[PDB]
Structure formats: C-alpha cells, structure tokens
mmCIF file of C-alpha atoms in Angstrom:
data_model
loop_
_atom_site.group_PDB
_atom_site.id
_atom_site.type_symbol
_atom_site.label_atom_id
_atom_site.label_comp_id
_atom_site.label_asym_id
_atom_site.label_seq_id
_atom_site.Cartn_x
_atom_site.Cartn_y
_atom_site.Cartn_z
ATOM 1 C CA UNK A 1 0.017 -0.046 -0.057
ATOM 2 C CA UNK A 2 2.790 2.415 0.872
ATOM 3 C CA UNK A 3 5.472 1.316 3.303
ATOM 4 C CA UNK A 4 5.274 -2.517 3.372
ATOM 5 C CA UNK A 5 8.894 -3.107 4.342
ATOM 6 C CA UNK A 6 9.594 -0.851 7.216
ATOM 7 C CA UNK A 7 6.845 -0.310 9.715
ATOM 8 C CA UNK A 8 6.160 2.727 12.010
ATOM 9 C CA UNK A 9 7.954 0.869 14.798
ATOM 10 C CA UNK A 10 10.851 -1.004 13.154
ATOM 11 C CA UNK A 11 11.350 1.972 10.799
ATOM 12 C CA UNK A 12 12.190 3.963 13.949
ATOM 13 C CA UNK A 13 14.687 1.306 15.055
ATOM 14 C CA UNK A 14 16.724 1.676 11.914
ATOM 15 C CA UNK A 15 16.076 5.448 12.459
ATOM 16 C CA UNK A 16 17.194 5.491 16.085
ATOM 17 C CA UNK A 17 19.452 2.286 16.256
ATOM 18 C CA UNK A 18 21.201 3.319 13.041
ATOM 19 C CA UNK A 19 21.353 6.973 14.277
ATOM 20 C CA UNK A 20 24.434 8.382 16.045
ATOM 21 C CA UNK A 21 23.867 6.815 19.421
ATOM 22 C CA UNK A 22 20.244 5.445 19.612
ATOM 23 C CA UNK A 23 17.913 8.405 19.986
ATOM 24 C CA UNK A 24 15.861 10.408 17.396
ATOM 25 C CA UNK A 25 13.585 13.459 17.461
ATOM 26 C CA UNK A 26 10.106 13.646 15.850
ATOM 27 C CA UNK A 27 11.616 15.468 12.824
ATOM 28 C CA UNK A 28 14.658 13.262 13.232
ATOM 29 C CA UNK A 29 13.189 9.787 12.700
ATOM 30 C CA UNK A 30 11.776 11.276 9.606
ATOM 31 C CA UNK A 31 14.937 12.897 8.094
ATOM 32 C CA UNK A 32 16.538 9.560 9.026
ATOM 33 C CA UNK A 33 14.345 7.026 7.003
ATOM 34 C CA UNK A 34 14.114 9.290 3.900
ATOM 35 C CA UNK A 35 18.009 9.515 4.182
ATOM 36 C CA UNK A 36 18.466 5.702 3.612
ATOM 37 C CA UNK A 37 14.897 5.009 2.392
ATOM 38 C CA UNK A 38 14.318 5.984 -1.257
ATOM 39 C CA UNK A 39 10.468 5.813 -0.625
ATOM 40 C CA UNK A 40 10.063 8.731 1.806
ATOM 41 C CA UNK A 41 11.072 11.827 -0.212
ATOM 42 C CA UNK A 42 7.985 13.543 -1.672
ATOM 43 C CA UNK A 43 5.152 12.018 0.356
ATOM 44 C CA UNK A 44 4.607 12.223 4.193
ATOM 45 C CA UNK A 45 1.047 13.080 4.796
ATOM 46 C CA UNK A 46 0.394 9.944 7.115
ATOM 47 C CA UNK A 47 3.390 8.330 8.893
ATOM 48 C CA UNK A 48 4.208 11.868 9.988
ATOM 49 C CA UNK A 49 1.920 11.896 13.080
ATOM 50 C CA UNK A 50 2.020 8.047 12.985
ATOM 51 C CA UNK A 51 5.673 7.907 14.210
ATOM 52 C CA UNK A 52 4.899 10.320 17.131
ATOM 53 C CA UNK A 53 1.916 7.916 17.878
ATOM 54 C CA UNK A 54 4.019 4.813 17.207
ATOM 55 C CA UNK A 55 6.759 6.017 19.453
ATOM 56 C CA UNK A 56 4.114 5.708 22.218
ATOM 57 C CA UNK A 57 2.513 2.337 21.419
ATOM 58 C CA UNK A 58 5.914 0.869 20.319
ATOM 59 C CA UNK A 59 7.001 -1.490 23.240
ATOM 60 C CA UNK A 60 10.843 -1.172 22.404
ATOM 61 C CA UNK A 61 10.895 2.605 22.369
ATOM 62 C CA UNK A 62 11.428 5.329 24.922
ATOM 63 C CA UNK A 63 12.439 8.987 25.329
ATOM 64 C CA UNK A 64 16.125 10.041 25.932
ATOM 65 C CA UNK A 65 15.269 12.014 29.171
ATOM 66 C CA UNK A 66 14.247 10.236 32.502
ATOM 67 C CA UNK A 67 10.432 10.644 31.919
ATOM 68 C CA UNK A 68 9.321 14.320 31.670
ATOM 69 C CA UNK A 69 9.941 15.802 28.327
ATOM 70 C CA UNK A 70 12.747 18.357 28.306
ATOM 71 C CA UNK A 71 14.083 19.880 25.065
ATOM 72 C CA UNK A 72 17.497 21.564 24.998
ATOM 73 C CA UNK A 73 20.912 21.088 23.322
ATOM 74 C CA UNK A 74 19.882 17.364 22.870
ATOM 75 C CA UNK A 75 16.591 15.626 23.724
ATOM 76 C CA UNK A 76 14.809 13.112 21.547
ATOM 77 C CA UNK A 77 13.385 9.506 21.420
ATOM 78 C CA UNK A 78 15.459 6.428 21.962
ATOM 79 C CA UNK A 79 14.999 2.605 21.747
ATOM 80 C CA UNK A 80 15.342 0.263 24.748
ATOM 81 C CA UNK A 81 18.828 -1.204 25.195
ATOM 82 C CA UNK A 82 17.880 -4.840 26.045
ATOM 83 C CA UNK A 83 15.319 -4.635 23.297
ATOM 84 C CA UNK A 84 17.807 -3.471 20.679
ATOM 85 C CA UNK A 85 19.309 -6.862 19.639
ATOM 86 C CA UNK A 86 15.578 -7.795 19.627
ATOM 87 C CA UNK A 87 14.027 -4.784 17.828
ATOM 88 C CA UNK A 88 16.977 -4.416 15.384
ATOM 89 C CA UNK A 89 16.321 -7.952 14.433
ATOM 90 C CA UNK A 90 13.307 -6.507 12.555
ATOM 91 C CA UNK A 91 15.257 -3.374 11.635
ATOM 92 C CA UNK A 92 18.000 -5.334 9.870
ATOM 93 C CA UNK A 93 15.485 -7.329 7.916
ATOM 94 C CA UNK A 94 12.244 -6.634 6.264
ATOM 95 C CA UNK A 95 8.849 -6.865 7.949
ATOM 96 C CA UNK A 96 8.392 -10.513 9.141
ATOM 97 C CA UNK A 97 5.542 -12.005 11.199
ATOM 98 C CA UNK A 98 6.458 -15.726 11.232
ATOM 99 C CA UNK A 99 7.131 -15.784 15.025
ATOM 100 C CA UNK A 100 7.631 -12.340 16.801
ATOM 101 C CA UNK A 101 4.152 -11.308 18.146
#
C-alpha cells in the first residue's frame, strides 16, 4: 500500500538504532528514514503523526530523558537497550511475522 517493508515501529529502530547513538527526534526519525529509504522523499501526509503515535504504542521505544519531556541542546526519542538486539532484528531485515508477536 505504501510502506510494506519498514513499519512505524521498526522503521524507527533503523532510524534511532542506525542513528548516532540510539535516539531520534520527531523530525529526526523522519529525516533519517528518507535518508536511507528512497521511498520517503515527496510524500509524508500519514506516517508523520504516526511515528509520534508509534513511539508511544511501540514497546521497544522510549524517550532520551528520564520521563518528563525536556528539550535543549539534545533531547529526543530512543529505543530500549535490552530490546535493541531484539528490535533491530526486525530493523536489519524486512517486515516478518513468522514468530515475533
């Protein structure tokens, strides 16, 4: 339909996991995928608010600060550490649902 390979949860992983350390901002995860993904470039009237909503429902994603939002010289989203080797598993490969909840 549009983004069948990366999903608004694993797409973030390659976005944050493949990012400098492991954190991305709302407009960071976006500039990230369109950077390595040749699909996101002239169309974003959908996953835009999705990611923000996905970063919430996603189970292996969190914010860089303790818990309260606090923007400054550096403050964005981030993926869990012990969930990385797990999430990235879907970030290094395409969307698979053979056995991964």
